[PDB]
Amino acid sequence: HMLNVGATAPDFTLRDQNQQLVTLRGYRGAKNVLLVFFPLAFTGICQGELDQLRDHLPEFENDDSAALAISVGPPPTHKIWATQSGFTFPLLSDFWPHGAVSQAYGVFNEQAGIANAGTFVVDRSGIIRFAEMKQPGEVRDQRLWTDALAALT
Amino acid sequence: HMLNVGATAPDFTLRDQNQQLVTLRGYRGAKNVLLVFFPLAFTGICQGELDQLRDHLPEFENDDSAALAISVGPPPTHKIWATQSGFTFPLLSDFWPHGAVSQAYGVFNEQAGIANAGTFVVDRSGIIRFAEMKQPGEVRDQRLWTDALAALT
Numbered sequence A, B: 001h002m003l004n005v006g007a008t009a010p011d012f013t014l015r016d017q018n019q020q021l022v023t024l025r026g027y028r029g030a031k032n033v034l035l036v037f038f039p040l041a042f043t044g045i046c047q048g049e050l051d052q053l054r055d056h057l058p059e060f061e062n063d064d065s066a067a068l069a070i071s072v073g074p075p076p077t078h079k080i081w082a083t084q085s086g087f088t089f090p091l092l093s094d095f096w097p098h099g100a101v102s103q104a105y106g107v108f109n110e111q112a113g114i115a116n117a118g119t120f121v122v123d124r125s126g127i128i129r130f131a132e133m134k135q136p137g138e139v140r141d142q143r144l145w146t147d148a149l150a151a152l153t
Helices: A044-055 A075-085 A100-104 A143-151 B044-055 B075-085 B100-104 B143-150
Strands: A013-015 A021-023 A032-037 A065-071 A091-093 A118-122 A128-133 B013-015 B021-023 B032-037 B065-071 B091-093 B118-122 B128-133
Touching: A032 A044, A032 A143, A044 A065, A044 A075, A075 A091, A118 A143, A128 A143, B013 B091, B032 B044, B032 B143, B044 B065, B044 B075, B075 B091, B118 B143, B128 B143
Parallel strands: A013 A091, A032 A065, A065 A091, B032 B065, B065 B091
Antiparallel strands: A013 A021, A032 A118, A118 A128, B013 B021, B032 B118, B118 B128
16 A cells, blocks of 8 residues: 655665666755656556656656656666657666565555556655555546646745 | 576476466477576667577577577566567566576576576476576677587487
């Protein structure tokens, strides 16, 4: 089960698609952070969700907000996928330990070994202010993410 | 340590790039099996290795032998990579549990969470007849594999 609103966002340091280290706490005091967990690269549903994030990127990656996509895939996988899909935002690798970050946020699927489609908004204080789990047969509403971020400014 | 010649090749059941199950024991009493463990899809080092396999595929995949590539990546990853590289042989997913099959063959890298570049030849009885792990920094000479399979007829 997902970490609830008001809980302290577990810290993490993960490799992005270009092998750079990205730390959640690096955004404390500066930007609200949108964490988009997704199951697998090269799958239709994740493609659609990240394509929509790509299309509305300025509403998520700006002076007040940062957007980080997270999955169990390693950087080379995310690099190729990001290049083909045109993703310029960071795709982080919760690869080894496998899904450690996903488990900390309570969005890890132990049966399949992938992250569930959970989204969080972490405020400037490192506190989770928004938490949304994707429901069966549907895509997450991203207007809801922009509004949640806009509300924290 | 890596499993060496004389040992029983641990049995496995894994999904190939097209989600079809592939078991090692299915080849016993029929074909010699080349097991090629590789670290990560979309990396130059693994590309070079599997390209060499692809370029000489008829010598490994015939009436007397089959070739299986294995790594920790999931099927969608291998599917896309196989399509881009023109790989027609099975790329199996040692994805969940993470690196289980690789750990059973003693070719799993615990620091990086990937399989080391290990190659095995399993004969019709299920015994390892060839076992070689890539000297990281040096490239695998695949004519040594063909000779290993040549001696099993």
